[PDB]
Design a protein around this motif. Structure first.
Motif, short mmCIF file in Angstrom:
data_model
loop_
_atom_site.label_atom_id
_atom_site.label_comp_id
_atom_site.label_asym_id
_atom_site.label_seq_id
_atom_site.Cartn_x
_atom_site.Cartn_y
_atom_site.Cartn_z
N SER F 170 0.82 -1.21 0.00
CA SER F 170 0.00 0.00 0.00
C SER F 170 0.86 1.26 0.00
CB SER F 170 -0.94 0.00 1.21
OG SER F 170 -0.24 -0.32 2.39
N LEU F 171 2.03 1.20 0.62
CA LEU F 171 2.97 2.31 0.53
C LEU F 171 3.41 2.52 -0.91
CD1 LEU F 171 5.06 1.57 3.74
CD2 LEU F 171 3.27 3.30 3.42
N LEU F 172 3.74 1.43 -1.61
CA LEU F 172 4.05 1.53 -3.03
C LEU F 172 2.83 2.00 -3.82
CD1 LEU F 172 6.19 -0.55 -1.79
CD2 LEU F 172 6.47 -1.32 -4.16
N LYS F 173 1.63 1.64 -3.36
CA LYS F 173 0.42 2.14 -4.00
C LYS F 173 0.34 3.66 -3.90
CE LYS F 173 -3.27 -0.27 -3.33
NZ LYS F 173 -4.45 -0.89 -2.67
N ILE F 174 0.63 4.20 -2.72
CA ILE F 174 0.64 5.65 -2.55
C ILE F 174 1.73 6.28 -3.40
CG2 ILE F 174 1.05 7.49 -0.88
CD1 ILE F 174 -0.29 5.81 1.23
N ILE F 175 2.88 5.62 -3.50
CA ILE F 175 3.96 6.12 -4.34
C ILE F 175 3.51 6.19 -5.79
CG2 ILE F 175 6.26 5.59 -5.22
CD1 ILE F 175 6.97 4.44 -2.53
N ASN F 176 2.83 5.15 -6.27
CA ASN F 176 2.32 5.15 -7.64
C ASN F 176 1.28 6.24 -7.84
OD1 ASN F 176 3.94 2.88 -7.97
ND2 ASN F 176 2.25 1.45 -7.62
N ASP F 177 0.43 6.46 -6.84
CA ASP F 177 -0.54 7.55 -6.93
C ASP F 177 0.16 8.89 -7.08
OD1 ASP F 177 -2.17 5.41 -6.45
OD2 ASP F 177 -2.76 6.03 -4.42
N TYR F 178 1.20 9.12 -6.27
CA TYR F 178 1.94 10.38 -6.37
C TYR F 178 2.61 10.51 -7.73
CZ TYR F 178 5.75 13.70 -5.77
OH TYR F 178 6.63 14.74 -5.93
N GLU F 179 3.16 9.41 -8.24
CA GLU F 179 3.78 9.43 -9.56
C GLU F 179 2.77 9.80 -10.64
OE1 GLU F 179 5.65 5.34 -9.14
OE2 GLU F 179 7.30 6.41 -10.10
N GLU F 180 1.58 9.22 -10.57
CA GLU F 180 0.56 9.49 -11.58
C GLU F 180 -0.02 10.89 -11.43
OE1 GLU F 180 -1.53 5.97 -10.36
OE2 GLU F 180 -1.33 5.09 -12.37
N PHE F 181 0.01 11.45 -10.22
CA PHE F 181 -0.48 12.81 -10.02
C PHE F 181 0.36 13.81 -10.80
CE2 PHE F 181 -2.36 11.62 -5.63
CZ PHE F 181 -3.42 11.03 -6.27
N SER F 182 1.68 13.64 -10.79
CA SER F 182 2.57 14.52 -11.52
C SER F 182 2.93 13.92 -12.88
CB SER F 182 3.83 14.79 -10.71
OG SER F 182 4.70 13.67 -10.73
#
Lengths: 171, 182, 170, 182, 170, 182, 175
Positions: F170-182
């Motif tokens: 889920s931490l990597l999930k949040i990382i992916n979310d941040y990546e896709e945001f920018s």
């Protein structure tokens, strides 16, 4: 000569000159050292054995050996025979003055103000100034030192009191 | 003018505390009036030169001073003198130009920590005014003040022994060694 | 210019500024030493070497552009052009000496005095410079002693400045 | 005024510990007397400018200092230089303006914890007084003190090896690497 | 308007307030630089420019209402009305500079002088710094680009706001 | 002085952990030199006032920080602001003055246990000294040090993912979310 | 009235109480600025307003009764009776301020200087100052008066401290 006199007068210090004037006051001022030396040569005895002792009194062995080409042995022998020039009273006064800091003289001028005017003492003065002022007030002499001893005891300098007692025992 | 350059190099490697220790150890040849404004090694060296204890041909006093503060690197780098030579020189009687009394006092001074200093100050509350017992005062300040009021000297040591006995006992060993040496 | 002009100049100057000015005009005061700065200005004006251009030159040398703008209403460009075109009143030797004196500190000057007390034997650096000139130990052609002294005290920027000046003059 | 502004920005990003490390690392070019009254990077940069080891057209020493303390973000931001360029420059002989012995000392100091520091201080009770063994001291202070008493010179390292052998042995590996460099 | 009132005022103030007052009055006495505040006050009295309202204004600039309540027997409102009516001797520029100097601690002024060392060459204070900058004809009540830029660079934005507000007032 | 009183009231409720989190969150607005001597909320408020980021007219920054540190009670008590209002303001582009990089880093920091912290330290003990890897050190200090050594940043995130994949996704999930945001 | 006892008293007091003593006698020595304790005592002696009763009252105010016992051999009862039978050298406002300053810790001075930061300046408050120093600075602005303690009352109430507020109200009722 004259060049040696010029070197002597130019290689001294203002406070050193003040101490010299205080010491020479006993023999009995010239503001400059050169005039005092002229007076000593003319009226007094400006002998080498006397000038060497005078400079040795202020711990200036560097000028003693550099100019006179003589070591401490000659002045030591002169003192052992007789201290013709200066008095042990002046020597003890200068030695006592040499061992006081700014706080000591400040406390002294504060305490002795009991019977001395504020303008009489003014400010920014050394222990020699206090001594000469007391001499002018005429209650300090090589025989009367009880008041000075008490005042010294007040500021908690008892080693100097022991030195005073030792000097009094000697003479 | 290489001698002056060497002296300057030696003086440039001293902090405030070493300067204070050197000033304290020179009380036997410098009056307080000549010592009050001293704030650098160069001024102290000039003062020593004025009494002709330091020159090109006479370096023994400087060597002893630097040895007593254990700054051996300064001794070896510039003066070209090793530890054995100084030890042998000081072993020889008649070469000691500084009283072992002051040296013992300084060595004792080096063996006190801040907590020990606080304990010492608290112990000497009774015989000493708190004005001379300022928290800013170090051990050397206390020693100078005690010597000033002649409550502690060459023959006056009993109060010192009693006060120092509480913190440690090797201090008593040092004191006894100094006394036996006298 | 007028007497009131030099009077205002004397009034507005500082003691350090007056001392630096007196040192700087030592080369042109070879004929006689003026006891007073205003006396020196009067002597220079009566000697004919003092003019508006010369006064602006001196003020620029002592870095007093405020007086020039307020009194003579002039810019640094005008004095720069006058310096470039008209002959320079004083040698850059004095300028370099003054600039060096502007950087050495009280501890630095005391250390230098202790260093150089060997050859000789409170005083400012400029006083030491005029003493050395009196003993004729340093001249606008010889600077090796001063360079070595500056090197020994780990102030190498001044050594670079001196070497650059020596290259420039020749 | 861009150069001064860049220097000020660089100085704005350092703590007290980094300043202490820099002061320790620049001891060769800076004497103790100037070292003592320094509490911010700006005064240190002023001293370096005075010795002309850092100017607008000369930035090599500053880059070396910043790299040696492992601060790469400042290099890439306010100097635009990554690890590869600095390493390649350090590969050039005669460009290592810091003697490797100091670097080795700093690296060894960087790999000690509080318990290891206490063990080191306890082990150094042989030839060093406990005054320098108080808990206030850090490892760099211990190195400075040992260097003062000619027990840890560039050629004198056996005592260091003996003391370090009581904690970790990889430190011996580091020392061996340094020796192989010489 | 007694000279003894002047002496009492001098006695009440300390050295820092004396420095600030000297800086404030520097502009009007541009012809004569007074080494002492007492001399400055005597000069103002002799010129006739010192009066009851003038003294009240000068004291209010230093934020010392105790003397006005005690000596002058006046409050801030009456002197405020008088200043709104009577023209003020000091420009808003001087009081703005004094206010800025009040809000800078001794740490950051070192940073400022380190930044500005390029244009010049030791316990300097901010008021002394701005006086020096004025002497070199760099900072004036007209142009303030240098100070604003340097203040912005050192992360002090409120002073930039104050300077901009003053400029918009003019 | 009502506004200052309100500011003092707000700063009173903060604790050591909250103060440390706030200090970390303001890295791009407070350099190291000013950051180090900060030990209370009042000093931080003064520093923020210096850069004109907190005053009577503008109060958005304080609300943003309080929302990020999840202090809803303080927001509803001393600021008369609700969570819905904060979400609405943050939805508007350009209103947020905190980089989502820092936000997600703090969020990851809040989702780590002691065992997870130990696993992270063991996984990243190769490139980091043990002194910075002390047990008391939290994730924020490690992140700061990693940013210092330009091993972690906006343009480089692979190491963070590789280390974080060893425990949770889920931490990597949040990382992916941040990546896709920018 | 010897200077010897003056010096003895001066040396027997720490720097902490020196500033308190200077604050307590501010009103009497108000035409001049006293630099330290010795100069202030000299000024009082010259003005003739200094006597043994004044010194005893000041020592009682600073609460160093043992000094009086050892030097003057006088107890707090005698000085209390003297103060009861004679006009007070120090105003009750001054002693109230001094007691308030003594009754606080450094954990509060930061908050107080932050609260009144609007009136003062960054440079003035940057250096560490005691409560009495802040009180003096406020007096220089004529914002606090012995008959006007409203701002200080509000500031004390703002720090969640009311016992000091009760003390202030007690002093006000004493008026």
């Amino acid at each position: 000569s004259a060049e040696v006199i010029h070197q002597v007068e130019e290689a001294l210090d203002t406070d050193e000159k003040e101490m010299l004037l205080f010491l020479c006051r006993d023999v009995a001022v010239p503001p400059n050292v050169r005039d005092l030396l002229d007076i000593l040569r003319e009226r007094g005895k400006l002998s080498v054995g006397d000038l060497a002792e005078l400079l040795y009194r202020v711990r200036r062995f560097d000028l003693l050996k550099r100019i006179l080409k003589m070591d401490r042995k000659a002045v030591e022998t002169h003192l052992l025979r007789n201290p013709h020039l200066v008095s042990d009273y002046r020597v003890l006064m200068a030695e006592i003055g040499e061992d006081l800091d700014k706080s000591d003289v400040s406390s002294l001028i504060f305490l002795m103000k009991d019977y001395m005017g504020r303008g009489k003492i003014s400010k920014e003065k050394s222990f020699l100034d206090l001594v000469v002022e007391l001499e002018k007030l005429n209650l300090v002499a090589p025989d009367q030192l009880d008041l000075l001893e008490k005042c010294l005891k007040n500021i908690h300098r008892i080693d100097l009191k022991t030195k005073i007692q030792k000097y009094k025992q000697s003479v | 003018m290489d001698f002056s350059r060497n002296l300057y190099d030696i003086g440039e490697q001293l902090d405030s505390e070493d300067l204070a220790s050197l000033k304290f150890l020179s009380l036997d040849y410098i009056p307080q009036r000549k010592q009050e404004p001293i704030k650098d090694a160069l001024m102290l060296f000039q003062r020593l030169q004025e009494k002709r204890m330091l020159e090109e041909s006479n370096l023994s006093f400087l060597k002893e001073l630097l040895f007593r503060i254990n700054r051996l690197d300064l001794l070896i780098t510039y003066l070209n003198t090793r530890k054995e030579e100084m030890e042998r020189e000081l072993q020889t009687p008649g070469r000691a130009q500084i009283s072992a009394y002051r040296v013992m006092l300084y060595q004792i001074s080096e063996e006190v920590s801040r907590s020990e200093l606080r304990s010492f100050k608290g112990g000497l509350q009774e015989e000493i005014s708190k004005c001379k017992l300022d928290d800013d005062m170090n051990l050397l300040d206390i020693f100078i003040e005690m010597e000033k009021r002649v409550i502690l000297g060459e023959g006056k040591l009993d109060i010192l022994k009693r006060v120092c006995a509480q913190i440690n006992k090797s201090l008593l060993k040092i004191i006894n060694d100094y006394e036996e040496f006298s």
